[PDB]
Scaffold this active site. Structure first.
Site, short mmCIF file in Angstrom:
data_model
loop_
_atom_site.label_atom_id
_atom_site.label_comp_id
_atom_site.label_asym_id
_atom_site.label_seq_id
_atom_site.Cartn_x
_atom_site.Cartn_y
_atom_site.Cartn_z
N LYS A 183 1.92 -5.40 -0.23
CA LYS A 183 0.66 -5.44 -0.96
C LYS A 183 0.66 -4.61 -2.24
CE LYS A 183 -1.11 -2.12 2.48
NZ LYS A 183 0.26 -1.75 2.92
N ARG A 184 1.73 -3.86 -2.52
CA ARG A 184 1.79 -3.07 -3.74
C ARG A 184 1.99 -3.96 -4.96
NH1 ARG A 184 3.47 -1.54 0.57
NH2 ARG A 184 5.74 -1.56 0.91
#
Ligand SMILES: [Cl-]
Lengths: 495, 493
Positions: free
Chosen positions: A252-253
């Site tokens: 999710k970064r």
């Protein structure tokens, strides 16, 4: 064997519904349907919220999936929740114990920690060392009578290799030494993933399972459990791992991994599933736009990928645009309005902008960001008199993590979390919040940002804080590892 | 005492004017504060159907209403001067029979040299009266010859005219300053002075509130009432509406369209409160109020003699006060309904479809359709083929040509703007770059001509003028020569 094909998805709700869960669920649904079979759903609530089940069930319905049986639609093999099947797992765990395929382990947690540290100090493999494997059955019963707590562990062959059959890849050979003496039943009498998956899959008469290739090392344990029970192990096909564009495991970064984010950002569900199909599969002619029915009609296991598709969010948006243009003008209009016609959301937005608007025409300017994806921001926008670039990044990262953990996304929880952070660092709140106006609204003047965060929701709020951290250059691997440690040490901010 | 009846006599000449709402507000208020009625009369003697509807809808939205009019009928129908022509022709001939009017056969060219000779000779510019001394028998002879004519009123050679105004008291104007006004035009239809004396008599008007700018005409009306033997209504002259610089309220500086303010998000209650604050104040100095509150405490003597200033920002702040009194629910619904036009929405969706990839892109590409004035700067109007000077000539000429369309349609906009590009030695692609900035606020947007059709005439012209101000504007004689060029421009539609 002419045994009716049946597949399933077994999601473990842990807050945000992950795209991987829909991706795997897509291919079990597709395969079962292409064989004239059924696709069911099982909630594996491990208790790692009460409504987290409703989160995942809603996220799969919107994504276009449906299941013949499950916790909400019922079914002959009920209950379809692991929490409501504790007696079943204990029953079969004791059946392995009776048949000699499992044993009670009485090791205390301190003894296990010591065992692991001795192995590391000697450079030996870190695994259970069979402390209680040779204990006779009568001796094991005697210690239970003394009140000794215990787990149940499966036995594992001492030598040789395991041979697993994968539908796509063929033969899989894993040495038995590399297979752990897996804990099947915990001390509290509840199962682990491997005991529950085998028992539920067999009792629900699952015949095929498609799962991520990350589970390949587990496959020998599943084969052993089926042999121990004398049950027919379903056929297995392993899907390729979802990846970031840089070919690392999806995270999710770089780009969001929530299904409900892509809904909130304007991706039609048909486009999202279209793209996830392309993550592990190619249609007979390598057509990049297709529907679920088209994929089912020609589905072929041998066309599943093991190669290097990647999850390029920009390509997903391109595909959504091709869907948007093939709609009629009327369909597009009703989709834009419906996508933004949440009456509760609209009432809150009007309440927020009423103090700041002088004309009805001012509404679009103050309320536009509630319907954007990621506001147009730059590093210079985050200029702060009191705080420097590094400190702003630390505030954005720590807030992102703390906010990600909220059991409920309420305005008060958000306020207590960011107020707790400010108090912990002795930064006055008004300075602490200056970055959030930029990240969330795209300018330094806006409606109260904490209320705006509540309205847009967790998925959008977290997508805009992560975008801002990228916009500010991020943090290096070393500086970020230290910051993650600092995050674990923060106090609980909710009263 | 006769029952009190007031009215307005607007011309459906296109865009309804806030000044028409201003006068209509005080005639309606005065009648209602006197147990009387308010009348609507359409001065459509000069030639349309659409324009009449546009102005009735404009005043209805503002919150005015009338007991008789073209839409509702009434005992003194018809309420259109276009359906009363034979009535004005009879009375204008009555003055002829009675010696109070005469036929003037001056051709236009004769009048042009009349004024030119007067100016060059340093004599007052007026009608010299060359046909005033013709006897009836001589006059009829020219009519039988086919000589076209108008009918002009007679005016006393000497003396003064006393005008009983309800606020200023007594206003004396010598007859030397009053022209032999044309009453009946060459083709048989009345001028304003004949039509309003006749209609205010037949429709039993008793008081008329009109702009102070029309005070020099008052002696002419008094003469017409004396000639007909009718009781002139009591006059009250309102202060003239002014720009922030004290000049006459001009579209050039501020927008004058009633419907523009509707499109910009101005509540009608706010607009009427602000127009009512121009001349007349309320007893407690209060600056926010309703129609009925103005009516109850209404007093003629509380009208202002000075010129009120039409600050657009003061109107916007007042609307902000009105918006904040609504509940969240009412405010929400008022915003959505203000933008709920289904035809507008279908047009907008069609226009942005080729350029969006996410539903969240809709507001970024469609935001300008619901803005008031896009945020623009002179730097945004950066053209390679054109400089700051040339672009201004483009935007002014487009604004003038675009104000005269009979029907605001995309097809008419295309033919217009295509033509101006042709007679400018400018390719169409370069001709429209300024239009993208002024309308959409961005060099990149959906097709600008389609957008101008969606937002309407009012909003398109407001943003084009706002662009002219941003670039610095071309005033002085520069705008005068440009006005001549626009006059000499050929027809495109
Ligand atoms: Cl008048």
């Amino acid at each position: 064997m002419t045994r009716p094909v049946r597949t399933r998805i077994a999601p473990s709700p842990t807050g945000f519904p992950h795209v991987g869960t829909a991706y795997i669920a897509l291919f079990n649904l597709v395969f079962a349907k292409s064989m004239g079979g059924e696709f069911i759903l099982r909630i594996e609530d491990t208790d790692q919220t009460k409504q987290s089940e409703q989160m995942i069930l809603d996220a799969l319905k919107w994504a276009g999936l449906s299941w013949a049986e499950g916790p909400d639609v019922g079914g002959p093999h009920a209950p379809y929740r692991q929490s409501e099947r504790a007696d079943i797992y204990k029953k079969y765990a004791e059946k392995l114990l009776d048949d000699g395929h499992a044993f009670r382990c009485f090791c205390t947690p301190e003894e296990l920690d010591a065992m692991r540290e001795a192995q590391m100090a000697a450079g030996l493999p870190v695994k259970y060392d069979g402390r209680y494997a040779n204990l006779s059955r009568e001796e094991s019963d005697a210690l239970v009578a003394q009140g000794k707590p215990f787990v149940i562990r499966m036995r594992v062959p001492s030598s040789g290799v395991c041979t697993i059959k994968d539908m796509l890849r063929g033969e899989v050979v894993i040495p038995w030494e590399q297979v752990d003496m897996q804990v099947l039943l915990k001390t509290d009498g509840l199962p682990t993933y491997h005991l529950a998956n085998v028992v539920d899959d067999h009792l629900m008469q699952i015949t095929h399972v498609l799962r991520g290739e990350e589970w390949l090392p587990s496959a020998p344990k599943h084969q052993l459990l089926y042999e121990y029970f004398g049950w027919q192990m379903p056929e297995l096909c392993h899907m390729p791992l979802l990846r970031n564009p840089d070919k690392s495991k999806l995270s999710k970064r770089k780009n969001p991994t929530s299904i409900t984010y892509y809904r909130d950002a304007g991706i039609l569900p048909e486009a999202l599933m279209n793209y996830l199909g392309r993550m592990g599969y190619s249609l007979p002619n390598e057509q990049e736009k297709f529907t679920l029915d088209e994929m089912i009609q020609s589905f072929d296991i041998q066309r599943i990928s093991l190669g290097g598709p990647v999850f390029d969010i920009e390509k997903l948006y391109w595909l959504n645009g091709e869907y948007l243009r093939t709609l009629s003008v009327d369909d597009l209009k009703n989709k834009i309005l419906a996508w933004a016609s949440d009456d509760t959301k609209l009432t809150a937005i009007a309440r927020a902008i009423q103090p700041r608007i002088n004309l009805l025409s001012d509404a679009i300017n103050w309320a536009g960001f509630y319907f954007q994806n990621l506001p147009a921001i730059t590093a210079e926008d985050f200029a702060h008199k009191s705080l420097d670039n590094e400190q702003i990044l630390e505030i954005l990262y720590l807030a992102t993590w703390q906010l990600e953990n909220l059991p409920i996304w309420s305005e008060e929880n958000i306020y207590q979390t960011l107020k707790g952070l400010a108090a912990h660092f002795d930064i006055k709140l008004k300075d602490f919040m200056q970055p959030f106006f930029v990240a969330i609204a795209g300018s330094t003047s806006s409606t109260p940002v904490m209320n705006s965060m509540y309205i847009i929701g967790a998925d959008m709020t977290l997508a805009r804080l992560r975008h801002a951290c990228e916009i500010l250059g991020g943090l290096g691997k070393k500086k970020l590892k230290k910051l993650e440690e600092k995050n674990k040490s923060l106090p609980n901010f909710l009263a």
